[PDB]
């Protein structure tokens, strides 16, 4: 189908940053204090962008 | 010059000596409990330490 064609066409573009993205996500889960991660989850449950909250 | 009745006196002396030894050697040092000695057991945990109060 056309969806498979789009998948096999966009595989190589979509996957170039996936390594660094997963690296940053995992390094955050590991190095960051779990209270900060819990606060992030809370704020996202409250419909807020916790990155903007942190910057503010 | 040593009669046979004087032997148990010597045995009593040496018994006193070895008892004074064994009452000390019967004691032994237990496992250390100072947290400063074992802080790295917790530093190296797979998760960060939660200071919960
Ligand atoms: C190229 C190949 C051949 C080369 C030939 C040379 C010519 C080609 C030139 C490049 C081709 C352009 C492709 C680029 C566009 C693209 O992303 O394609 C996929 C893109 C996604 O299509 P899709 O099927 O809808 O994807 C569904 C999901 O995204 C699917 O979700 P997913 O799980 O598969 O993930 C998809 C992917 C992409 O997710 C997206 O959906 C994004 C969509 C973007 C919109 C397209 C923008 C295109 C701009 C064109 C200019 O996710 C990511 O990788 C996230 C990227 C986030 C940025 C990476 C950040 C790295 C860290 C760097 C900062 C570090 C700072 C320091 C920190 C220090 C801390 C200590 O395809 C298109 O939309 C077509 C665009 C035309």
JSON list of C-alpha atoms and ligand atoms in Angstrom, two decimals:
[
{"chain": "A", "resi": 1, "resn": "UNK", "atom": "CA", "xyz": [0.00, 0.00, 0.00]},
{"chain": "A", "resi": 2, "resn": "UNK", "atom": "CA", "xyz": [0.94, 3.67, -0.10]},
{"chain": "A", "resi": 3, "resn": "UNK", "atom": "CA", "xyz": [1.51, 3.73, 3.67]},
{"chain": "A", "resi": 4, "resn": "UNK", "atom": "CA", "xyz": [4.23, 1.08, 3.36]},
{"chain": "A", "resi": 5, "resn": "UNK", "atom": "CA", "xyz": [5.83, 3.09, 0.55]},
{"chain": "A", "resi": 6, "resn": "UNK", "atom": "CA", "xyz": [5.86, 6.21, 2.71]},
{"chain": "A", "resi": 7, "resn": "UNK", "atom": "CA", "xyz": [7.29, 4.19, 5.60]},
{"chain": "A", "resi": 8, "resn": "UNK", "atom": "CA", "xyz": [10.15, 2.76, 3.54]},
{"chain": "A", "resi": 9, "resn": "UNK", "atom": "CA", "xyz": [10.78, 6.18, 1.96]},
{"chain": "A", "resi": 10, "resn": "UNK", "atom": "CA", "xyz": [10.83, 8.18, 5.21]},
{"chain": "A", "resi": 11, "resn": "UNK", "atom": "CA", "xyz": [12.67, 5.53, 7.25]},
{"chain": "A", "resi": 12, "resn": "UNK", "atom": "CA", "xyz": [16.13, 6.94, 6.56]},
{"chain": "A", "resi": 13, "resn": "UNK", "atom": "CA", "xyz": [15.18, 10.62, 7.08]},
{"chain": "A", "resi": 14, "resn": "UNK", "atom": "CA", "xyz": [13.16, 9.96, 10.24]},
{"chain": "A", "resi": 15, "resn": "UNK", "atom": "CA", "xyz": [15.91, 7.88, 11.86]},
{"chain": "A", "resi": 16, "resn": "UNK", "atom": "CA", "xyz": [18.88, 10.25, 11.65]},
{"chain": "A", "resi": 17, "resn": "UNK", "atom": "CA", "xyz": [18.09, 12.07, 14.95]},
{"chain": "A", "resi": 18, "resn": "UNK", "atom": "CA", "xyz": [16.44, 9.13, 16.74]},
{"chain": "A", "resi": 19, "resn": "UNK", "atom": "CA", "xyz": [19.76, 8.09, 18.28]},
{"chain": "A", "resi": 20, "resn": "UNK", "atom": "CA", "xyz": [20.51, 11.49, 19.81]},
{"chain": "A", "resi": 21, "resn": "UNK", "atom": "CA", "xyz": [16.87, 11.93, 20.82]},
{"chain": "A", "resi": 22, "resn": "UNK", "atom": "CA", "xyz": [16.78, 8.60, 22.66]},
{"chain": "A", "resi": 23, "resn": "UNK", "atom": "CA", "xyz": [20.19, 9.39, 24.14]},
{"chain": "A", "resi": 24, "resn": "UNK", "atom": "CA", "xyz": [18.97, 12.69, 25.57]},
{"chain": "A", "resi": 25, "resn": "UNK", "atom": "CA", "xyz": [15.74, 11.13, 26.84]},
{"chain": "A", "resi": 26, "resn": "UNK", "atom": "CA", "xyz": [17.62, 8.32, 28.58]},
{"chain": "A", "resi": 27, "resn": "UNK", "atom": "CA", "xyz": [20.31, 10.62, 29.98]},
{"chain": "A", "resi": 28, "resn": "UNK", "atom": "CA", "xyz": [17.52, 12.77, 31.37]},
{"chain": "A", "resi": 29, "resn": "UNK", "atom": "CA", "xyz": [15.81, 9.77, 32.95]},
{"chain": "A", "resi": 30, "resn": "UNK", "atom": "CA", "xyz": [19.13, 8.72, 34.51]},
{"chain": "A", "resi": 31, "resn": "UNK", "atom": "CA", "xyz": [20.99, 11.88, 35.54]},
{"chain": "A", "resi": 32, "resn": "UNK", "atom": "CA", "xyz": [18.03, 14.11, 36.39]},
{"chain": "A", "resi": 33, "resn": "UNK", "atom": "CA", "xyz": [16.58, 14.05, 39.87]},
{"chain": "A", "resi": 34, "resn": "UNK", "atom": "CA", "xyz": [13.37, 11.96, 39.92]},
{"chain": "A", "resi": 35, "resn": "UNK", "atom": "CA", "xyz": [11.50, 14.76, 41.70]},
{"chain": "A", "resi": 36, "resn": "UNK", "atom": "CA", "xyz": [12.05, 16.96, 38.64]},
{"chain": "A", "resi": 37, "resn": "UNK", "atom": "CA", "xyz": [10.75, 14.20, 36.36]},
{"chain": "A", "resi": 38, "resn": "UNK", "atom": "CA", "xyz": [7.70, 13.76, 38.59]},
{"chain": "A", "resi": 39, "resn": "UNK", "atom": "CA", "xyz": [7.07, 17.51, 38.48]},
{"chain": "A", "resi": 40, "resn": "UNK", "atom": "CA", "xyz": [7.36, 17.40, 34.69]},
{"chain": "A", "resi": 41, "resn": "UNK", "atom": "CA", "xyz": [4.78, 14.61, 34.55]},
{"chain": "A", "resi": 42, "resn": "UNK", "atom": "CA", "xyz": [2.53, 16.57, 36.91]},
{"chain": "A", "resi": 43, "resn": "UNK", "atom": "CA", "xyz": [2.70, 19.76, 34.85]},
{"chain": "A", "resi": 44, "resn": "UNK", "atom": "CA", "xyz": [2.04, 17.83, 31.65]},
{"chain": "A", "resi": 45, "resn": "UNK", "atom": "CA", "xyz": [-0.98, 16.33, 33.42]},
{"chain": "A", "resi": 46, "resn": "UNK", "atom": "CA", "xyz": [-2.03, 19.92, 34.17]},
{"chain": "A", "resi": 47, "resn": "UNK", "atom": "CA", "xyz": [-1.94, 20.80, 30.46]},
{"chain": "A", "resi": 48, "resn": "UNK", "atom": "CA", "xyz": [1.15, 22.99, 30.89]},
{"chain": "A", "resi": 49, "resn": "UNK", "atom": "CA", "xyz": [4.45, 23.00, 29.03]},
{"chain": "A", "resi": 50, "resn": "UNK", "atom": "CA", "xyz": [6.98, 22.30, 31.82]},
{"chain": "A", "resi": 51, "resn": "UNK", "atom": "CA", "xyz": [9.88, 23.56, 29.69]},
{"chain": "A", "resi": 52, "resn": "UNK", "atom": "CA", "xyz": [8.29, 27.01, 29.43]},
{"chain": "A", "resi": 53, "resn": "UNK", "atom": "CA", "xyz": [7.49, 26.85, 33.15]},
{"chain": "A", "resi": 54, "resn": "UNK", "atom": "CA", "xyz": [11.12, 26.06, 33.95]},
{"chain": "A", "resi": 55, "resn": "UNK", "atom": "CA", "xyz": [12.39, 28.85, 31.70]},
{"chain": "A", "resi": 56, "resn": "UNK", "atom": "CA", "xyz": [10.00, 31.33, 33.30]},
{"chain": "B", "resi": 1, "resn": "UNK", "atom": "CA", "xyz": [65.51, -29.64, 93.38]},
{"chain": "B", "resi": 2, "resn": "UNK", "atom": "CA", "xyz": [61.84, -29.50, 92.26]},
{"chain": "B", "resi": 3, "resn": "UNK", "atom": "CA", "xyz": [59.43, -31.66, 94.32]},
{"chain": "B", "resi": 4, "resn": "UNK", "atom": "CA", "xyz": [56.35, -33.06, 92.64]},
{"chain": "B", "resi": 5, "resn": "UNK", "atom": "CA", "xyz": [53.99, -31.14, 94.93]},
{"chain": "B", "resi": 6, "resn": "UNK", "atom": "CA", "xyz": [55.20, -27.83, 93.43]},
{"chain": "B", "resi": 7, "resn": "UNK", "atom": "CA", "xyz": [53.93, -28.68, 89.92]},
{"chain": "B", "resi": 8, "resn": "UNK", "atom": "CA", "xyz": [50.23, -27.75, 90.37]},
{"chain": "B", "resi": 9, "resn": "UNK", "atom": "CA", "xyz": [51.29, -24.34, 91.66]},
{"chain": "B", "resi": 10, "resn": "UNK", "atom": "CA", "xyz": [53.08, -23.76, 88.35]},
{"chain": "B", "resi": 11, "resn": "UNK", "atom": "CA", "xyz": [50.04, -25.11, 86.51]},
{"chain": "B", "resi": 12, "resn": "UNK", "atom": "CA", "xyz": [47.83, -22.65, 88.39]},
{"chain": "B", "resi": 13, "resn": "UNK", "atom": "CA", "xyz": [50.15, -19.78, 87.47]},
{"chain": "B", "resi": 14, "resn": "UNK", "atom": "CA", "xyz": [50.08, -20.69, 83.78]},
{"chain": "B", "resi": 15, "resn": "UNK", "atom": "CA", "xyz": [46.30, -21.18, 83.95]},
{"chain": "B", "resi": 16, "resn": "UNK", "atom": "CA", "xyz": [45.94, -17.65, 85.31]},
{"chain": "B", "resi": 17, "resn": "UNK", "atom": "CA", "xyz": [48.14, -16.36, 82.50]},
{"chain": "B", "resi": 18, "resn": "UNK", "atom": "CA", "xyz": [46.34, -18.13, 79.67]},
{"chain": "B", "resi": 19, "resn": "UNK", "atom": "CA", "xyz": [42.97, -17.16, 81.14]},
{"chain": "B", "resi": 20, "resn": "UNK", "atom": "CA", "xyz": [44.03, -13.51, 81.18]},
{"chain": "B", "resi": 21, "resn": "UNK", "atom": "CA", "xyz": [44.94, -14.05, 77.53]},
{"chain": "B", "resi": 22, "resn": "UNK", "atom": "CA", "xyz": [41.74, -15.78, 76.44]},
{"chain": "B", "resi": 23, "resn": "UNK", "atom": "CA", "xyz": [39.42, -13.32, 78.19]},
{"chain": "B", "resi": 24, "resn": "UNK", "atom": "CA", "xyz": [40.86, -10.70, 75.81]},
{"chain": "B", "resi": 25, "resn": "UNK", "atom": "CA", "xyz": [41.15, -12.91, 72.73]},
{"chain": "B", "resi": 26, "resn": "UNK", "atom": "CA", "xyz": [37.58, -14.10, 73.27]},
{"chain": "B", "resi": 27, "resn": "UNK", "atom": "CA", "xyz": [36.55, -10.61, 72.19]},
{"chain": "B", "resi": 28, "resn": "UNK", "atom": "CA", "xyz": [36.37, -9.79, 68.49]},
{"chain": "B", "resi": 29, "resn": "UNK", "atom": "CA", "xyz": [35.55, -6.72, 66.42]},
{"chain": "B", "resi": 30, "resn": "UNK", "atom": "CA", "xyz": [32.16, -6.81, 64.75]},
{"chain": "B", "resi": 31, "resn": "UNK", "atom": "CA", "xyz": [31.10, -5.39, 61.42]},
{"chain": "B", "resi": 32, "resn": "UNK", "atom": "CA", "xyz": [31.56, -1.65, 61.00]},
{"chain": "B", "resi": 33, "resn": "UNK", "atom": "CA", "xyz": [28.40, 0.47, 61.02]},
{"chain": "B", "resi": 34, "resn": "UNK", "atom": "CA", "xyz": [29.80, 3.96, 60.36]},
{"chain": "B", "resi": 35, "resn": "UNK", "atom": "CA", "xyz": [27.77, 5.43, 57.52]},
{"chain": "B", "resi": 36, "resn": "UNK", "atom": "CA", "xyz": [30.80, 7.32, 56.21]},
{"chain": "B", "resi": 37, "resn": "UNK", "atom": "CA", "xyz": [32.37, 3.92, 55.53]},
{"chain": "B", "resi": 38, "resn": "UNK", "atom": "CA", "xyz": [29.31, 2.71, 53.59]},
{"chain": "B", "resi": 39, "resn": "UNK", "atom": "CA", "xyz": [28.09, 5.91, 51.92]},
{"chain": "B", "resi": 40, "resn": "UNK", "atom": "CA", "xyz": [29.39, 4.70, 48.56]},
{"chain": "B", "resi": 41, "resn": "UNK", "atom": "CA", "xyz": [27.20, 1.60, 48.79]},
{"chain": "B", "resi": 42, "resn": "UNK", "atom": "CA", "xyz": [24.27, 4.00, 48.44]},
{"chain": "B", "resi": 43, "resn": "UNK", "atom": "CA", "xyz": [26.00, 6.44, 46.09]},
{"chain": "B", "resi": 44, "resn": "UNK", "atom": "CA", "xyz": [26.41, 3.57, 43.60]},
{"chain": "B", "resi": 45, "resn": "UNK", "atom": "CA", "xyz": [22.78, 2.45, 43.67]},
{"chain": "B", "resi": 46, "resn": "UNK", "atom": "CA", "xyz": [21.00, 2.06, 40.35]},
{"chain": "B", "resi": 47, "resn": "UNK", "atom": "CA", "xyz": [18.72, 4.98, 41.30]},
{"chain": "B", "resi": 48, "resn": "UNK", "atom": "CA", "xyz": [19.38, 8.37, 42.85]},
{"chain": "B", "resi": 49, "resn": "UNK", "atom": "CA", "xyz": [18.79, 8.70, 46.57]},
{"chain": "B", "resi": 50, "resn": "UNK", "atom": "CA", "xyz": [15.41, 10.13, 47.57]},
{"chain": "B", "resi": 51, "resn": "UNK", "atom": "CA", "xyz": [15.71, 12.49, 50.53]},
{"chain": "B", "resi": 52, "resn": "UNK", "atom": "CA", "xyz": [12.15, 11.99, 51.75]},
{"chain": "B", "resi": 53, "resn": "UNK", "atom": "CA", "xyz": [10.85, 14.10, 54.63]},
{"chain": "C", "resi": 1, "resn": "LIG", "atom": "C1", "xyz": [17.29, 12.28, 3.71]},
{"chain": "C", "resi": 1, "resn": "LIG", "atom": "C2", "xyz": [17.46, 10.85, 3.21]},
{"chain": "C", "resi": 1, "resn": "LIG", "atom": "C3", "xyz": [18.15, 10.87, 1.84]},
{"chain": "C", "resi": 1, "resn": "LIG", "atom": "C4", "xyz": [19.09, 12.07, 1.78]},
{"chain": "C", "resi": 1, "resn": "LIG", "atom": "C5", "xyz": [19.00, 12.72, 0.40]},
{"chain": "C", "resi": 1, "resn": "LIG", "atom": "C6", "xyz": [19.39, 14.19, 0.51]},
{"chain": "C", "resi": 1, "resn": "LIG", "atom": "C7", "xyz": [18.16, 15.05, 0.27]},
{"chain": "C", "resi": 1, "resn": "LIG", "atom": "C8", "xyz": [17.19, 14.86, 1.43]},
{"chain": "C", "resi": 1, "resn": "LIG", "atom": "C9", "xyz": [17.33, 16.02, 2.41]},
{"chain": "C", "resi": 1, "resn": "LIG", "atom": "C10", "xyz": [16.64, 15.66, 3.72]},
{"chain": "C", "resi": 1, "resn": "LIG", "atom": "C11", "xyz": [15.24, 15.12, 3.44]},
{"chain": "C", "resi": 1, "resn": "LIG", "atom": "C12", "xyz": [14.22, 15.89, 4.27]},
{"chain": "C", "resi": 1, "resn": "LIG", "atom": "C13", "xyz": [13.68, 14.99, 5.38]},
{"chain": "C", "resi": 1, "resn": "LIG", "atom": "C14", "xyz": [13.53, 15.80, 6.66]},
{"chain": "C", "resi": 1, "resn": "LIG", "atom": "C15", "xyz": [12.05, 15.87, 7.06]},
{"chain": "C", "resi": 1, "resn": "LIG", "atom": "C16", "xyz": [11.69, 14.67, 7.94]},
{"chain": "C", "resi": 1, "resn": "LIG", "atom": "O1", "xyz": [11.86, 14.72, 9.11]},
{"chain": "C", "resi": 1, "resn": "LIG", "atom": "O2", "xyz": [11.13, 13.53, 7.37]},
{"chain": "C", "resi": 1, "resn": "LIG", "atom": "C17", "xyz": [10.21, 12.88, 8.20]},
{"chain": "C", "resi": 1, "resn": "LIG", "atom": "C18", "xyz": [8.84, 13.54, 8.05]},
{"chain": "C", "resi": 1, "resn": "LIG", "atom": "C19", "xyz": [7.84, 12.86, 8.97]},
{"chain": "C", "resi": 1, "resn": "LIG", "atom": "O3", "xyz": [6.85, 12.22, 8.23]},
{"chain": "C", "resi": 1, "resn": "LIG", "atom": "P1", "xyz": [5.72, 11.36, 9.06]},
{"chain": "C", "resi": 1, "resn": "LIG", "atom": "O4", "xyz": [5.39, 10.09, 8.33]},
{"chain": "C", "resi": 1, "resn": "LIG", "atom": "O5", "xyz": [4.47, 12.19, 9.21]},
{"chain": "C", "resi": 1, "resn": "LIG", "atom": "O6", "xyz": [6.31, 10.99, 10.55]},
{"chain": "C", "resi": 1, "resn": "LIG", "atom": "C20", "xyz": [5.42, 10.52, 11.50]},
{"chain": "C", "resi": 1, "resn": "LIG", "atom": "C21", "xyz": [6.04, 10.64, 12.89]},
{"chain": "C", "resi": 1, "resn": "LIG", "atom": "O7", "xyz": [6.83, 11.79, 12.93]},
{"chain": "C", "resi": 1, "resn": "LIG", "atom": "C22", "xyz": [6.92, 9.42, 13.16]},
{"chain": "C", "resi": 1, "resn": "LIG", "atom": "O8", "xyz": [7.46, 9.49, 14.44]},
{"chain": "C", "resi": 1, "resn": "LIG", "atom": "P2", "xyz": [8.95, 8.84, 14.70]},
{"chain": "C", "resi": 1, "resn": "LIG", "atom": "O9", "xyz": [8.95, 8.07, 16.01]},
{"chain": "C", "resi": 1, "resn": "LIG", "atom": "O10", "xyz": [9.31, 7.90, 13.57]},
{"chain": "C", "resi": 1, "resn": "LIG", "atom": "O11", "xyz": [10.05, 10.05, 14.76]},
{"chain": "C", "resi": 1, "resn": "LIG", "atom": "C23", "xyz": [10.19, 10.81, 13.60]},
{"chain": "C", "resi": 1, "resn": "LIG", "atom": "C24", "xyz": [11.21, 11.93, 13.81]},
{"chain": "C", "resi": 1, "resn": "LIG", "atom": "C25", "xyz": [10.65, 13.24, 13.25]},
{"chain": "C", "resi": 1, "resn": "LIG", "atom": "O12", "xyz": [9.55, 13.64, 14.01]},
{"chain": "C", "resi": 1, "resn": "LIG", "atom": "C26", "xyz": [8.69, 14.54, 13.36]},
{"chain": "C", "resi": 1, "resn": "LIG", "atom": "O13", "xyz": [7.60, 14.19, 13.06]},
{"chain": "C", "resi": 1, "resn": "LIG", "atom": "C27", "xyz": [9.13, 15.97, 13.07]},
{"chain": "C", "resi": 1, "resn": "LIG", "atom": "C28", "xyz": [8.42, 16.47, 11.82]},
{"chain": "C", "resi": 1, "resn": "LIG", "atom": "C29", "xyz": [9.10, 17.73, 11.30]},
{"chain": "C", "resi": 1, "resn": "LIG", "atom": "C30", "xyz": [8.31, 18.32, 10.14]},
{"chain": "C", "resi": 1, "resn": "LIG", "atom": "C31", "xyz": [9.10, 18.25, 8.84]},
{"chain": "C", "resi": 1, "resn": "LIG", "atom": "C32", "xyz": [10.14, 19.37, 8.80]},
{"chain": "C", "resi": 1, "resn": "LIG", "atom": "C33", "xyz": [10.85, 19.34, 7.44]},
{"chain": "C", "resi": 1, "resn": "LIG", "atom": "C34", "xyz": [11.63, 20.63, 7.21]},
{"chain": "C", "resi": 1, "resn": "LIG", "atom": "C35", "xyz": [12.02, 20.68, 5.73]},
{"chain": "C", "resi": 1, "resn": "LIG", "atom": "C36", "xyz": [13.04, 21.80, 5.51]},
{"chain": "C", "resi": 1, "resn": "LIG", "atom": "O14", "xyz": [11.45, 12.06, 15.18]},
{"chain": "C", "resi": 1, "resn": "LIG", "atom": "C37", "xyz": [12.67, 12.67, 15.50]},
{"chain": "C", "resi": 1, "resn": "LIG", "atom": "O15", "xyz": [13.69, 12.23, 15.09]},
{"chain": "C", "resi": 1, "resn": "LIG", "atom": "C38", "xyz": [12.67, 13.91, 16.39]},
{"chain": "C", "resi": 1, "resn": "LIG", "atom": "C39", "xyz": [13.65, 14.95, 15.86]},
{"chain": "C", "resi": 1, "resn": "LIG", "atom": "C40", "xyz": [13.85, 16.05, 16.90]},
{"chain": "C", "resi": 1, "resn": "LIG", "atom": "C41", "xyz": [15.10, 16.85, 16.58]},
{"chain": "C", "resi": 1, "resn": "LIG", "atom": "C42", "xyz": [16.37, 16.10, 17.01]},
{"chain": "C", "resi": 1, "resn": "LIG", "atom": "C43", "xyz": [17.07, 16.83, 18.15]},
{"chain": "C", "resi": 1, "resn": "LIG", "atom": "C44", "xyz": [18.47, 16.28, 18.35]},
{"chain": "C", "resi": 1, "resn": "LIG", "atom": "C45", "xyz": [19.15, 17.02, 19.50]},
{"chain": "C", "resi": 1, "resn": "LIG", "atom": "C46", "xyz": [19.80, 18.30, 18.97]},
{"chain": "C", "resi": 1, "resn": "LIG", "atom": "C47", "xyz": [19.75, 19.41, 20.02]},
{"chain": "C", "resi": 1, "resn": "LIG", "atom": "C48", "xyz": [20.65, 19.07, 21.21]},
{"chain": "C", "resi": 1, "resn": "LIG", "atom": "C49", "xyz": [20.89, 20.33, 22.05]},
{"chain": "C", "resi": 1, "resn": "LIG", "atom": "C50", "xyz": [21.98, 20.09, 23.10]},
{"chain": "C", "resi": 1, "resn": "LIG", "atom": "C51", "xyz": [21.38, 19.50, 24.37]},
{"chain": "C", "resi": 1, "resn": "LIG", "atom": "C52", "xyz": [22.44, 19.49, 25.48]},
{"chain": "C", "resi": 1, "resn": "LIG", "atom": "C53", "xyz": [21.86, 18.81, 26.72]},
{"chain": "C", "resi": 1, "resn": "LIG", "atom": "C54", "xyz": [22.99, 18.40, 27.66]},
{"chain": "C", "resi": 1, "resn": "LIG", "atom": "O16", "xyz": [8.40, 13.43, 6.73]},
{"chain": "C", "resi": 1, "resn": "LIG", "atom": "C55", "xyz": [7.66, 14.53, 6.27]},
{"chain": "C", "resi": 1, "resn": "LIG", "atom": "O17", "xyz": [6.89, 15.07, 6.99]},
{"chain": "C", "resi": 1, "resn": "LIG", "atom": "C56", "xyz": [7.85, 15.01, 4.84]},
{"chain": "C", "resi": 1, "resn": "LIG", "atom": "C57", "xyz": [8.41, 16.43, 4.84]},
{"chain": "C", "resi": 1, "resn": "LIG", "atom": "C58", "xyz": [8.59, 16.91, 3.39]}
]
